[PDB]
Amino acid sequence: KVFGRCELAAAMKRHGLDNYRGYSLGNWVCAAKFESNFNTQATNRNTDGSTDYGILQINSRWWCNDGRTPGSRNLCNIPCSALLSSDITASVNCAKKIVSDGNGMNAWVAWRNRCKGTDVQAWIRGCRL
């Protein structure tokens, strides 16, 4: 499913991301924009053989099981395919664990390089939230 910007903002808000670990909703929407272009079905292979899945491009190296990432963990206790669903519940719940692990949103390289320090509020402008 390819979310609209405000549609995704609304779903992220309902699921508790707004100000989660101190990160305003615009941070999460900006991250999703540059990670996946709001596409829940997005996948990308990493150089190390792990794969990133879903709207927030969650990595099989640590967070989910895809059966093809040797030596990896499954800290969110989910198949990576759960992260591709039209329902963002699994991605949000796993994202909450990632952002709590010490590095905050710096875990998402595209957030660090493209969202951090910018006017992220722009990403939720106009939405009925």
Read off the tokens for 71: 């030596």
Q: Where are the beta strands (DSSP E) in the chain?
A: 43-45, 51-53, 58-59
The catalytic residue among 7, 18, 48, 52 is 52
Task: Say whether 71 sits in a helix, a strand or coil.
Answer: coil
Size of the site for Cl ion (CB under 5 A): 7
Of 87 and 103, the one with the shorter C-beta distance to Cl ion is: 103
Give the DSSP letter of residue 66: -
Residue 66 falls in the annotated catalytic set: no
Pick one of Cl ion, Na ion, Rh ion, none as the site partner of residue 104 (Cβ within 5 to 8 A by kind).
Cl ion
User: What Å distances lie between residue 10 and 6, 63, 84, 99, 124, CA to CA?
Assistant: 6, 25, 18, 20, 9
Q: Does residue 54 interact with Cl ion by CB under 5 A?
A: no
The footprint of Cl ion on residues 69-98 (CB under 5 A) is: 69, 72
Nearer to Cl ion, 79 or 104 (CB): 104
**Interface with Na ion by CB under 5 A: which residues?**
60, 65, 69, 72, 74
Binding residues for substrate: 101
